[PDB]
Design a protein around this ligand. Structure first.
Ligand SMILES: CC(C)CCC[C@@H](C)[C@H]1CC[C@H]2[C@@H]3CC=C4C[C@@H](OC(=O)CCC(=O)O)CC[C@]4(C)[C@H]3CC[C@]12C
Ligand SMILES: CC(C)CCC[C@@H](C)[C@H]1CC[C@H]2[C@@H]3CC=C4C[C@@H](OC(=O)CCC(=O)O)CC[C@]4(C)[C@H]3CC[C@]12C
Ligand SMILES: *[C@@H]1O[C@H](CO)[C@@H](O)[C@H](O)[C@H]1NC(C)=O
Lengths: 359, 55, 128, 32, 339, 228
């Protein structure tokens, strides 16, 4: 509905433009595309018009000139538009393998993040200022991966409900953007705190958790309401699913800036771990083995995959694998944090082996 | 240095001058105290609930 | 009762050799690290050597390294100190000392002026 | 925020929804 | 010389004492209590947990009320716990943070504590202002204080790392008698039901029975292989148990002048830090370095149960006077009441 | 009645819990240090850098509070009261540079004690002046106490003071390797040794303790995150 309105006005702009340009083939305004004089026997290739949602501007069009090509059955000018169509056999097929990857990815995250959250609340001997932030990091992963599952089953696969355009569509998108920003800004809180233990002011203790709560939960609301308001005021589309808006950078702008700082925290932290291995003169066969493993276990916590793979490639092969590797990283990120920081933690391991054997 | 060895000897002189009962008699009088106060031992037998102040 | 009795010793000529024994009783000899300490005239106690439970980890002080060899027999509860190439500066009362706690890696207080798990000591004089 | 990593899920829900909310464009007879 | 005259005079007396003890050994304790049925299985559960202390807990002593207990932690604090309600009644900031023992007077009016400061600090709880202040500091020891036990509100017996014990007069503050004879750090002491005698275990692998009124050593008990960290009196006062670093507990008899049983196991190699008997004397609860407290049958040397709730080294344990519960302190800063 | 007595314990416990939180603020914001020396080892001047059974010396470096404990009237039998310091930040060990073998035996048992396996040791090899002139005089060589010094050579990372003889440089770096040989044989990442050549005139002694304690707290945090 709203997308068709934006596409109809765009078609008028293209018609008006070559109308001024006009003022062996000739020049006539065809559907969504107007051509000019061309020699006989030429295949004019151009970008697909992006007015329709099925049409993708990545492929080229075909226009045969003889006197333009005439349809052999209707005696009307017709241009070839097959490649512009959304490939239902494969483009939808590729989406379904990513659709079931997000559900299975977030589901495996919920299971391991609820178990890991219970170990850190029940076992009070593991309670510390590092676990207190890890419990808030675990919760924002569960809530984010619960709204995504809720959003990807009721809102997304139901085109009829999106055509109906209810307010319930909007409030769920607002609860998603807020929960998605809180999930990203809490990776910054984990980074800011970890940066203070290792790099800046190692001696001082009692890092006031009130500032982490305001940054993790409180601040993400500030750019969310600014975006959610300006969305409904100027660019209102069904269930706010469209990402063509520039107003969406009100959230993903600070979100990207917050994750960039986490990338510069990983550089300072990795600079100390090598320095601490140079005051002992460890064998380089091992110094480079514990460094990559330290960097590897800090990527899911600090969300570095959003900084090292920020933009999607323009190639059909690099972009396809980019979709596969990133979706696996983003969806299984909650599962990777619960395994490394709770299951594979030696402190948690040696205690649960004590209490379970006793009880 | 040497006077402390005199204290070790004289202390042993007194410790040797004691009357020692038999082991069979000492094992019987320790068992009789166990068999007597057995029913008065809260740890030896779990009392019913609401009678122990640590419910 | 933990008792350590040092056997052997006496006066010896410079360059001679002396073998000291240590009969143990009142404790499981195999569970403890055994030590050798000495006290020179006009000087405090000085550690000499030690041997682990089984007899693998052996250590000596530098002044007697290569000349003294410590050994133990768990099946007889005895400790040996074979002394070779003796010097006149090695004149001291040699004590058979035991580490305080069994199965432990550390060994505290074996050279203190007062120590319970240490025998009476045997005299070793190196003079003409 | 299209073509971005942090804005990648929204890009997927936008594309995956266009398969059910809109019918296939007619490119056969009568098309231009 | 005469030193070897005395060094061989003592070995003939040691042979005379040893030959007199064997003459009294006609049937071991295991053969006497071989006909009684075992105690079965002792299933005790953590009833309460006390989470107030910051640093490791070194000692605890039950009050005579069997409800209030005091604990000492090396963070420089004394906390008196109400075991029933788990509410802290008093928090006492110590002068020196290194405390190694604490005691509760049988009248509930005073608590004592000592450590690396070599001073026994008596704390008056029922003051004129309703607060807690240091009532008396007992100076005179040349080593750290390892244990102390009130005889009354004016007399207290302390053990110290200077190989000597001492009975103090809190009114004057000066020592009234010194118990010399130990050749190692005296670690633990235990008072008999009557306050006429007490037994102390030291790092010389020997326990000595002392006479409080006269100040003389009466008996000496051997058999342990390493330092004695814990000692406890039998309820009737005719025997006592000891805890050593040789991973064994032993029961000695005052009238037999020798040991009667050993409480050990092949799979037990850690030291014992605390011991205590049940009200009937049938259960010997020992605390070990392996974070677990074991329950021993004092008559059959068998193991009846295990208290395995602590995460760090079990440093102390004690049964109440009524025998209802068992408080166990550990280095993990937590006290646990068992029943 | 009885509920007021119950409430009295409930509120008095809350007031105690309030002061216990303040005392937890200062207890975690301080670093406890154990100063362990030897007979005439020169550890009194270390205290001077700014009876009783234990002494106290409170100093603050870069707005960080340190608490150093000096052993007073305690016997030479240390196997019992040494367990009280299994939670300190670092043990400051002072050695005077067979007396030297006794400090090596004491350092060994401390380094391998079951309760001190996670406690780092700051090593202050004191008396560099006396070490510097006896060797340069050659009156009583060090070869008698440690015969393996003949087959020893100056290590690669030697930074001798401008104006220091090459011979005394070989002596101090050999005694330092003696303590490092013990520490590296059982160090499994739990604790580490920080040796420092200190003199009776050095004034940067408290800055060293500050810099090594910073490494200890950093290495502790890296273990909790399992990074290092
Ligand atoms: C329904 C969702 C998708 C949107 C709205 C979320 C908020 C209503 C909730 C969800 C998570 C909550 C937070 C989860 C945990 C904490 C930590 C908590 O601090 C603690 O350590 C808890 C101590 C305690 O209360 O026992 C303070 C509240 C806070 C920030 C909560 C504040 C309220 C939040 C943001
Ligand atoms: C409306 C939904 C989406 C979010 C609701 C929570 C947020 C509004 C955040 C922003 C500021 C946060 C607070 C910032 C600081 C603190 C103090 C922190 O510790 C205290 O000081 C506790 C005692 C006290 O606050 O009086 C406990 C969490 C809390 C209240 C946070 C709770 C969660 C808050 C209210
Ligand atoms: C349009 O182009 C496609 C190439 O993708 C071709 O398969 C199709 O046959 C063309 N249409 C016509 C009518 O030739």
């Amino acid at each position: 509905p709203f997308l068709y309105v934006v596409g109809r006005k765009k078609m008028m702009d293209a018609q008006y433009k070559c109308y001024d340009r006009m003022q062996y083939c000739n020049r006539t305004w065809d559907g969504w595309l107007c051509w000019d004089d061309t020699p006989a026997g030429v295949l004019s290739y151009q970008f697909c018009p992006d007015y329709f949602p099925d049409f993708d501007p990545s492929e080229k069009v075909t226009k045969y000139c003889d006197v333009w090509f005439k349809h052999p059955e209707n005696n009307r000018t017709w241009s070839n538009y097959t490649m512009c169509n959304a490939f239902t056999p494969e483009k939808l097929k590729n989406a379904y393998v990513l659709y079931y990857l997000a559900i299975v990815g977030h589901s495996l995250s919920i299971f391991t993040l609820v178990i890991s959250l219970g170990i850190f609340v029940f076992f009070r001997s593991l309670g510390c200022q590092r676990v207190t932030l890890h419990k808030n990091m675990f919760l924002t992963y569960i809530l984010n991966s619960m709204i995504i599952i809720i959003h990807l089953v009721e809102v997304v696969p139901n085109g009829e409900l999106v055509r109906r355009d209810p307010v319930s569509c909007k409030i769920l998108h607002f609860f998603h953007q807020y929960m998605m920003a809180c999930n990203y800004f809490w990776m910054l809180c984990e980074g800011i705190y970890l940066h203070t233990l290792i790099v800046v002011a190692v001696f001082t203790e009692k890092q006031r958790l009130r500032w982490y709560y305001l940054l993790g939960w409180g601040f993400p609301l500030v750019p969310t309401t600014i975006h959610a308001i300006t969305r409904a005021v100027y660019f209102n589309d069904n269930c706010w699913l469209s990402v063509e808006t520039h107003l969406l950078y009100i959230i993903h702008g600070p979100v990207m800036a917050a994750l960039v700082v986490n990338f510069f925290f990983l550089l300072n932290i990795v600079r100390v771990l090598v320095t601490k291995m140079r005051e002992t003169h460890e064998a380089e066969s091992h110094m480079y083995l514990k460094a990559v493993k330290a960097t590897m276990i800090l990527v899911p916590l600090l969300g570095i995959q959003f900084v090292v793979f920020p933009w999607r490639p323009s190639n059909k092969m690099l972009g396809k694998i980019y979709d596969y590797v990133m979706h696996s990283l983003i969806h299984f990120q909650g599962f990777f944090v619960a395994t490394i920081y709770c299951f594979c933690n030696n402190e948690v391991q040696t205690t649960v082996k004590r209490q379970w054997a006793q009880f | 240095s040497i006077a402390q060895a005199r204290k070790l000897v004289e202390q042993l002189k007194m410790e040797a001058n004691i009357d020692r009962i038999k082991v069979s008699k000492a094992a019987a009088d320790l068992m009789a105290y166990c068999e007597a106060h057995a029913k008065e031992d809260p740890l030896l037998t779990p009392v019913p609930a609401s009678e122990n102040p640590f419910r | 009762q933990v008792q350590l009795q040092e056997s052997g010793g006496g006066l010896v000529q410079p360059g001679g050799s002396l073998r000291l024994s240590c009969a143990a009783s009142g404790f499981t000899f195999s569970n403890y690290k055994m030590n050798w300490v000495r006290q020179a005239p006009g000087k405090g106690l000085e550690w000499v050597s030690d041997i682990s439970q089984s007899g693998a980890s052996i250590s000596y002080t530098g002044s007697v390294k290569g000349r003294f060899t410590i050994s133990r027999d768990n099946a007889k509860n005895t400790l040996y100190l074979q002394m070779n190439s003796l010097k006149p500066e090695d004149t001291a009362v040699y004590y058979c000392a035991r580490c305080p706690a069994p199965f432990t890696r550390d060994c505290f207080d074996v050279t203190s002026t007062t120590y319970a798990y240490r025998g009476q000591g045997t005299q070793v004089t190196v003079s003409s | 925020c299209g073509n971005l990593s942090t804005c990648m899920l929204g890009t997927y829900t936008q594309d995956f929804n266009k398969f059910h909310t809109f019918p296939q464009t007619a490119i056969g007879v009568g098309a231009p | 010389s005469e030193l070897d005259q005395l060094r061989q005079e003592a070995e003939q007396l040691k042979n005379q004492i040893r030959d007199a003890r064997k003459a009294c050994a006609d049937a071991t304790l295991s053969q006497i209590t071989n006909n009684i049925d075992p105690v079965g299985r002792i299933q005790m559960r953590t009833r309460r947990t006390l989470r107030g202390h910051l640093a490791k807990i070194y000692a605890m002593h039950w009050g005579t009320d069997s409800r209030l207990l005091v604990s000492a932690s090396q963070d420089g604090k004394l906390i008196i716990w109400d075991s029933y309600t788990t509410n802290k009644v008093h928090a006492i900031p110590l002068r020196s943070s290194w405390v190694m023992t604490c005691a509760y007077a049988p009248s509930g009016n005073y608590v004592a504590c000592g450590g690396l400061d070599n001073i026994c600090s008596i704390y008056n709880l029922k003051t004129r202002e309703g607060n807690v202040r240091v009532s008396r500091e007992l100076a005179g020891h040349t080593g750290y204080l390892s244990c102390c036990r009130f005889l009354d509100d004016n007399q207290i017996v302390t053990s110290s790392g200077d190989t000597t014990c001492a009975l103090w007069d809190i009114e004057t503050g000066q020592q009234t008698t010194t118990f010399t004879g130990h050749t190692g750090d005296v670690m633990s002491l235990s008072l008999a039901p009557d306050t006429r005698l007490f037994v102390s275990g030291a790092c010389d692998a020997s326990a000595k029975l002392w006479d409080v009124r006269e100040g003389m050593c009466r008996q000496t008990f051997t058999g342990h292989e390493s330092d004695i960290n814990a000692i406890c009196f039998f309820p009737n006062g005719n025997a006592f148990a000891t805890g050593s670093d040789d991973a064994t507990c032993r029961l000695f008899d005052l009238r037999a002048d020798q040991e009667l049983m050993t409480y050990s196991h092949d799979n037990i190699i850690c030291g014992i830090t605390s011991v205590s008997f049940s009200k009937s004397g049938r259960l010997l609860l020992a605390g070990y370095d392996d974070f677990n407290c074991n329950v021993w049958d004092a008559l059959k040397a068998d193991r009846a149960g295990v208290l395995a709730g602590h995460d760090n080294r079990v440093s102390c344990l004690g049964v109440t006077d009524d025998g209802m519960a068992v408080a166990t302190g550990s280095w993990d800063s937590f006290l646990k009441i068992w029943n | 009645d009885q509920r007021n007595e119950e409430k009295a314990q409930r509120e008095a416990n809350k007031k105690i819990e309030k002061q216990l939180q303040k005392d937890k603020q200062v207890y975690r914001a301080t670093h406890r240090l154990l100063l362990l020396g030897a007979g005439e080892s020169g550890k009194n001047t270390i205290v001077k850098q700014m009876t009783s059974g234990i002494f106290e010396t409170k100093f603050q470096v870069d707005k960080v509070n340190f608490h150093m404990f000096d052993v007073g009237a305690q016997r030479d039998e240390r196997r019992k009261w040494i367990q009280c310091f299994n939670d300190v930040t670092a043990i400051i060990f002072v050695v005077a540079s067979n007396r030297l073998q006794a400090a090596l035996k004491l350092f060994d048992s401390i380094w391998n004690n079951k309760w001190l396996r996670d406690t780092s040791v700051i090593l202050f090899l004191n008396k560099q002046d006396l070490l510097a002139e006896k060797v340069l005089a050659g009156k009583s060589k060090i070869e008698d106490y440690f015969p393996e010094f003949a087959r020893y050579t100056t290590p690669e990372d030697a930074t001798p003071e401008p104006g220091e003889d090459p011979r005394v440089t070989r002596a101090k770096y050999f005694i330092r390797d003696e303590f490092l040989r013990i520490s590296t044989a059982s160090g499994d990442g739990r604790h580490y040794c920080y040796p420092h050549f200190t003199c009776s005139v050095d004034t940067e002694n408290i800055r060293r303790v500050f810099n090594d304690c910073r490494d200890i707290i950093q290495r502790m945090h890296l273990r909790q995150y399992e990074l290092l």
